[PDB]
Write a protein that binds this DNA or RNA. Structure first.
Ligand SMILES: Nc1ncnc2c1ncn2[C@@H]1O[C@H](COP(=O)(O)OP(=O)(O)OP(O)(O)=S)[C@@H](O)[C@H]1O
Ligand SMILES: Nc1ncnc2c1ncn2[C@@H]1O[C@H](COP(=O)(O)OP(=O)(O)OP(O)(O)=S)[C@@H](O)[C@H]1O
Ligand SMILES: [Mg+2]
Ligand SMILES: [Mg+2]
Ligand SMILES: [Zn+2]
Lengths: 322, 432, 432, 432
DNA sequence: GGCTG
DNA sequence: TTTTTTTTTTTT
């Protein structure tokens, strides 16, 4: 198919749609908009469940409200035949910033031992030394607007735990804020100094031997050579130590997305971790530590004797499925 | 009370043996309870015994479920515990819960039926019952009690059988004594009775005469005609009942005054039923069509027939068969089986007609091997009759009946009785 | 839809007289519509006539309603429509509206009954019907139809049926005295009538004679030909109508002047019908293509026929069989059934012809047993006329017509009759 | 389920006897489970008896491991309880667990072999097998089970086969001396027996007589009828058992005193079984429907049949072939195979009836080639009898039961034997 | 703030 | 919509 011309035609046709958004990352062409087929959610007028994907082999539209999915050509012919004919004829026609200041931030290692967040991190059972990499803020929106103005409409006083993300050079080019309260718009609000900032945590702290890729940076704290891809799309290329890295996901065997990711990793022949014999059964490492009492050295012992790759990984995954 | 039901299924043999055969997965919920009951039912199917807690939470729950379903099932299984309750209150409460859940499911189903039928065609979700069969679903939901009624025990149910014998609550007597002395009281309710006559020998004079007799006997008669219009069949019935020749109604020798007088004389009699004639195109009506017609008659005209007369069995179509078959053996047999199933479902005496083979034409005797369309039709019929008036009986206004297959009695007792046909009045009279 | 219903209750007579007995207050609403209908019903009860707008407003003024009710009723009364919609659509749409509202009310009532049933027995309403009344209630919702016509009801349609016998509503005359004599007034609508041709008997001569006779009587005739083109069949029709011999047209004896003069003379007569000749390839026309042809003629040509004449039954194709054979019994039986179904569903007289059996060919007398189509044509044919052409009859320009199957009347009344066949003009004349 | 396996190894005894030989240390784990199983195996090797919990603690004390795992092992032996689970489920679950672990170990071994093969020969491991051993070892993991017997060995199992000869354990006598003589002990369990005859000849009569004879021999007989109603079959059984003619029941020549007296006289017998008569629509029940019926009969009452009389297999439907997808031959063969599979599964004698062809309806002799529908039904049947009735036989109240197929004896020793048939009593009597 | 096939 | 095996049935 012809992705670029389809993307252009979809852009022309859907420029006028409600909630139209040009959600285009560095490698994908997605358009977010309110689904004209169903008007998206009747209750929520700000929902834009109409999505066009040009990254797909053929730019395809799908609504998450009316569950209407089709190619761009089908929608164009069934809704705008006028430009559809011109498009179908065209078918054969073609034929960096570094964060330097920490306003309203007090590092946990230098924070007072009586601070409530210190007590919470004790409930989180984080190693004391790791506190020299985490700050606490009472003015997270204020701090972000001080560093990146216009981010927050109001600089409300919100206490969060700020983990700066240091590049291999050790330069904080981003930061993730964890809301202390159980209720929040997002558990981990991550803001980067520049769009090309590193999405991998602990890169500056990588040592010799195998490197363990985890989910949460706090989880990586308990682990030597623990790096954390800070959200985003899992891309092998952006990940260093492509020779020696070790994949460690959450212990959620019945969860479908986790096993999908693990299948993706193993099909790339990677070296992954398996929990099919773990004495603890919590979802993640920190949960095993705080609940099952799991201690980090036992965890490392288990993991160094549970890494599998290739056919070994595949067969050990089959059993771990369910 | 799902938790109590599950707990006493696991931890009570008497309660299990009492309530398990009436348990269904569509009674508990769309969450943990349904999954737990699925595990229990799978274990009972596989091993014919009630599972324990270990079997539930290891041998069965360690299979395939999402995280939320797994957590719910684990919590429910851990919550199960034996509780001392009387085994008369538990059964009654479980029966009430089952009845309530059956009613809830039936209400949801009929709501979905109405919603589906409200939608226009091409999106009507076929195989879903029509709006006509809403009350039967509710009636089925009402009778969902825990009573053991599987079949007819010979020794345990002889009282009801004797009541049926003494009441004779299966026979529908004829108006002809000759047909009653060979059927031992007439035809039975769930039966398929057949006439075989040939071409222009009868085969609708006989059906019309039987319909007229049943009408005079107070029965509701439904005449489904595939080969004749409603008006011509009603004219034959009028000739039979008004004692007027069929030609006289055509030439015009009968006045409107006497016609209306005879009709009103018949109306005032309390011993007169209702005859409804419905025509379908030749080859365009099946058992499903007849069921739809019955439902429409019951809803609109409040008409529940006791006699159903199909003018011709061989020019109908099979509801089960989807692709037309050139083999007349299978199609006619399927049609006859469907008609007899309809008769036994509606408890209606079903009369129909069959065509004899060309060899039997102008033959003084017609054997069962002269059936034309299919040899499976005589196997499914409860009573067959053959009309063999060749040449001399026509001059004497007679017809000879052979009694080829008789399931009401011995067909070798009174094989021939020489019925008195009258073609002008379209009726049968005896030779007493 | 409620606005239209109220407007055409106020401003119509036939609609009122048709839909008033099936109109209830609970069918409309719980707001302005219900109040307006209550006003209408009160006025019609106190004064047995449809109220006017001024009278309706006076009644609303002298009524007990609050401010919001007063405003709603006033607005609705001011919003009435006197538009003259078509009656059939109006009746059907109001019937659908009434049925939907009745179903909704019944479903709500059964839900309320179930909810009341699941309440402390000491604490429940006594007026609420028991659960066992649920299946009956829904039945009353399904028994709502403005007009009940399911089949022909004996003793309930005797006055309409008599008007059929006196008015001969079904008969279509023949223009030949002998054929009218043996059919008691001609052939009937929704029938299949066939001609059996023996030795030296063309099948299309008789069909063209019948088509011409029907054309002269004012009937719309659709002639579907298989083995011949449209021009050839219409040339046979011209030979019969213009009195020109068939060979004279090919030779050129008749000039354009005489042809046009005769055609315009026929066109002047108001007792002439329309003839539409449609050609189909051999075996390429089943009795489903004819339905499409009729639909196209009705939509485009506005031509709705009363007579359909198929050139030859054997050449046709059975839609049910799909597989085709030059001379196979199963196909002929299916073709006859499909054509008779088409005749019944279109209310038209359908004519066709077949070849008699070889033994029938040699014998001047033709027996139903002596027929190429045995038990297939003398089972689906209302009338089967047999045509015999021997050497002596041909020398006298005659053909012996024998009646082999007559559903219309007695087959043996006038079985044999001599017909004056003219093979040049393709005509049948009577014999004194 | 390693905890359950270890607990029932230590405590349960028969489970230990059945499962211990098929136990290896590689099947459990690489952690506490493996250590516990190694301790148990060492103890059972030292002392040829199952150890106790105190013995396990002593073995842990004297034979020690590294404390890291030793704590896990000592906390692993704190949960092994008696937990009296059922034996069959425990054995099946242990077999499934060991099979799964064997498959996992085989896959890991073949992966390791492939990895070793990739390595250069300089540093490759020597203990690992070559790649050529990958298939066979996989087979060694495929054929792992607890079934010590894979088949029947002629010389090894000469014992336990002579037991089947002393005690028949298969034969069910017929209550008729002639049938026992021609069968050498009666019909066998897990067999399909067929009575073939023409239409209206006695097939249901013979089946009812057999059912009555079995009922008199203390047998549970389940009569499944596809055509006749339950009351009709029960009336035939009453006529056979109560020595009252069918005419007497339909003419009122028997009083309620006689009927109840005879029924209670039969009830007082200790040599009487149970007869459940079940009715299904024609063509609306299959082998799975029969299995569901048997399950509900076993649950809702203490009824496990030993004789199953299906009225006619030809009017059933296959549980594998879709409806009317195949011809008569394939469908009837599939139905017969399904019925025989049901018979062998339930270990019951299954009697049924079949129709003969149209050509054998008036024949004094019936051959195996006269079977209607499939010819695979004689192939699937274990015992087939042909019921022949002629005018001379009917004049003497006799039939001509002929052996068509016999897997119980030589069909030629007594091929044709006369049998008196009382049609009024629906009874078979033997000429003596 | 993402999430489809 | 044709094609080919096998069977079963029926009609001539
Ligand atoms: N209008 C009539 N007047 C007098 N006799 C009639 C009339 N119609 C039919 N008959 C006679 O009734 C018999 C015809 O049988 P019907 O009851 O019409 O059914 P059928 O004709 O045998 O069925 P088929 O399939 O059409 S042959 C013959 O004996 C006719 O002579
Ligand atoms: N209800 C009955 N009343 C009197 N005699 C009967 C009755 N049913 C059967 N008979 C007699 O028993 C004979 C055989 O009947 P059945 O054995 O039931 O027949 P079948 O083998 O099931 O075949 P069908 O059903 O008749 S095609 C009949 O021909 C009659 O002589
Ligand atoms: Mg007829
Ligand atoms: Mg029977
Ligand atoms: Zn949408």
């Amino acid at each position: 198919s012809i992705p670029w011309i389809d993307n252009e035609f979809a852009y022309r046709a859907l420029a006028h749609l409600p909630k139209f958004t040009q959600v285009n990352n560095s490698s994908t062409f997605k358009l977010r908009f309110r689904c004209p087929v169903c008007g998206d959610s009747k209750t929520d007028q700000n929902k834009a469940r109409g999505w066009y994907y040009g990254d797909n082999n053929e730019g395809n539209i799908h609504c998450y409200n009316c569950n209407y999915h089709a190619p761009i050509g089908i929608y164009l012919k069934e809704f705008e035949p006028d430009l559809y004919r011109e498009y179908i004829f065209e078918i054969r026609k073609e034929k960096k910033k570094i964060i330097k200041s920490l306003p309203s931030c007090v590092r946990l290692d230098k924070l007072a031992e009586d601070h409530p967040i210190i007590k919470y991190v004790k409930a989180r059972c984080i190693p004391k030394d790791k506190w020299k990499y985490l700050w606490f803020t009472t003015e997270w929106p204020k701090l972000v607007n001080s560093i990146a103005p216009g981010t927050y409409k109001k600089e409300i006083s919100e206490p969060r735990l700020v983990i700066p993300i240091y590049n291999a050079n050790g330069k904080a080019e981003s930061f993730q804020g964890r809301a202390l309260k159980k209720d929040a718009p997002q558990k981990y609000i991550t803001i980067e100094a520049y769009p090309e900032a590193t999405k991998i945590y602990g890169v500056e702290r990588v040592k010799d031997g195998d490197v363990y890729v985890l989910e949460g940076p706090i989880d990586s704290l308990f682990i030597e050579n623990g790096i954390a891809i800070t959200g985003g799309q899992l891309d092998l290329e952006v990940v260093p130590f492509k020779d020696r890295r070790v994949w460690v996901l959450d212990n959620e065997p019945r969860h479908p997305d986790t096993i999908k990711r693990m299948t993706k990793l193993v099909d790339a022949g990677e070296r992954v971790m398996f929990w099919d014999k773990s004495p603890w059964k919590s979802k993640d490492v920190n949960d095993m530590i705080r609940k099952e009492g799991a201690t980090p050295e036992q965890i490392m012992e288990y993991m160094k004797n549970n890494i599998a790759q290739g056919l070994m990984a595949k067969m050990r995954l089959s059993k771990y499925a369910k | 009370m799902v938790e109590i039901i599950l707990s006493h299924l696991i931890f009570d043999q008497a309660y299990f043996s009492k309530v398990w055969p009436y348990m269904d997965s569509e009674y508990f919920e769309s969450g943990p309870a349904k999954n737990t009951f699925k595990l229990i039912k799978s274990h009972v199917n596989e091993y014919h015994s009630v599972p324990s807690i270990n079997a539930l939470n290891v041998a069965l729950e360690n299979s395939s479920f999402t995280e939320t379903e797994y957590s719910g099932v684990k919590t429910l299984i851990s919550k199960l515990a034996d509780s001392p309750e009387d085994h008369s209150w538990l059964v009654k409460e479980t029966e009430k819960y089952v009845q309530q859940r059956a009613m809830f499911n039936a209400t949801s189903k009929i709501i979905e039926i109405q919603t589906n039928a409200e939608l226009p065609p091409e999106k009507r979700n076929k195989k879903m019952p029509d709006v006509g069969a809403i009350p039967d679903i509710m009636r089925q939901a009402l009778s969902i009690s825990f009573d053991s009624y599987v079949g007819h025990d010979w020794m345990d149910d002889y009282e009801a059988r004797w009541l049926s014998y003494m009441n004779k609550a299966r026979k529908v007597p004829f108006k002809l004594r000759i047909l009653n002395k060979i059927t031992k009281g007439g035809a039975e309710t769930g039966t398929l009775n057949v006439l075989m006559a040939g071409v222009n020998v009868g085969k609708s004079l006989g059906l019309c005469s039987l319909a007229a007799d049943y009408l005079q006997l107070g029965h509701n008669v439904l005449y489904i005609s595939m080969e004749m219009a409603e008006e011509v069949c009603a004219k034959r019935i009028d000739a039979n009942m008004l004692d007027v020749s069929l030609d006289d109604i055509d030439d015009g020798h009968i006045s409107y005054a006497e016609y209306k007088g005879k009709m009103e004389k018949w109306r005032e009699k309390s011993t007169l039923g209702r005859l409804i004639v419905k025509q379908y195109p030749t080859g365009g009506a099946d058992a499903n069509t007849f069921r739809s017609l019955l439902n429409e008659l019951k809803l609109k005209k409040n008409f529940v027939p006791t006699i159903i007369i199909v003018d011709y069995l061989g020019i109908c179509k099979s509801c089960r068969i989807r692709v037309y078959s050139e083999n007349s053996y299978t199609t006619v047999k399927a049609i006859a089986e469907e008609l007899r199933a309809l008769a036994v479902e509606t408890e209606t005496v079903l009369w129909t007609a069959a065509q004899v083979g060309k060899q039997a034409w102008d033959s003084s005797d017609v054997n069962m091997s002269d059936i034309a369309e299919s040899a499976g039709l005589p196997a499914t019929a409860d009573f067959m009759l053959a009309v063999i008036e060749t040449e001399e009986l026509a001059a004497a206004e007679q017809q000879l009946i052979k009694q080829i297959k008789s399931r009401y009695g011995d067909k070798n007792k009174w094989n021939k009785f020489l019925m008195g046909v009258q073609k002008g009045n379209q009726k049968w009279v005896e030779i007493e």
